[PDB]
């Protein structure tokens, strides 16, 4: 991975690093993890509306959305701008709608 991003950290100016280093820094107090824009109660609620509106298709969530939600809700529980109980609630609302669409697809 790109070494040039880590030797150039300055406290509280944002940067990108590979997720396994962000979790290793966040295990100490030495980082905080900025949730992607799609982990916002606005963007999750637009995806839930898309899902209900288009029975024939899955919404354009990123390939890792369940995996990354589960990692960050456990390891970075304090870093969300929205209250994490409403994010867990909407991740479940999306999980359940897509499970119906899968059973229709089979």
């Amino acid at each position: 991975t790109d070494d040039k991003a880590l030797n150039n950290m300055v406290a509280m100016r944002s940067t990108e690093v590979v997720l396994w280093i962000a979790l290793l820094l966040k295990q100490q107090s030495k980082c905080s993890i900025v949730a992607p824009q799609w982990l916002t109660t606005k963007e999750l609620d637009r995806k839930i509306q898309y899902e209900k509106t288009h029975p024939d298709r899955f919404s354009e969530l990123p390939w890792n959305w369940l995996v990354l939600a589960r990692i960050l809700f456990n390891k970075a529980k304090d870093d969300f701008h929205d209250p994490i109980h409403e994010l867990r609630g909407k991740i479940q609302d999306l999980r359940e709608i897509r499970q119906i669409k899968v059973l229709k697809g089979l």
């Binding site: 509280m12 944002s14 905080s32 900025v34 304090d78 701008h81």
Partner: peptide, 18 residues
């Protein structure tokens, strides 16, 4: 970025946005 009816942030200080 503060959200709600008070202009100023509360004790679990949210991350500085950019």
């Amino acid at each position: 970025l503060v959200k709600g009816k008070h202009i100023w942030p509360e004790f679990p200080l949210p991350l500085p946005s950019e």
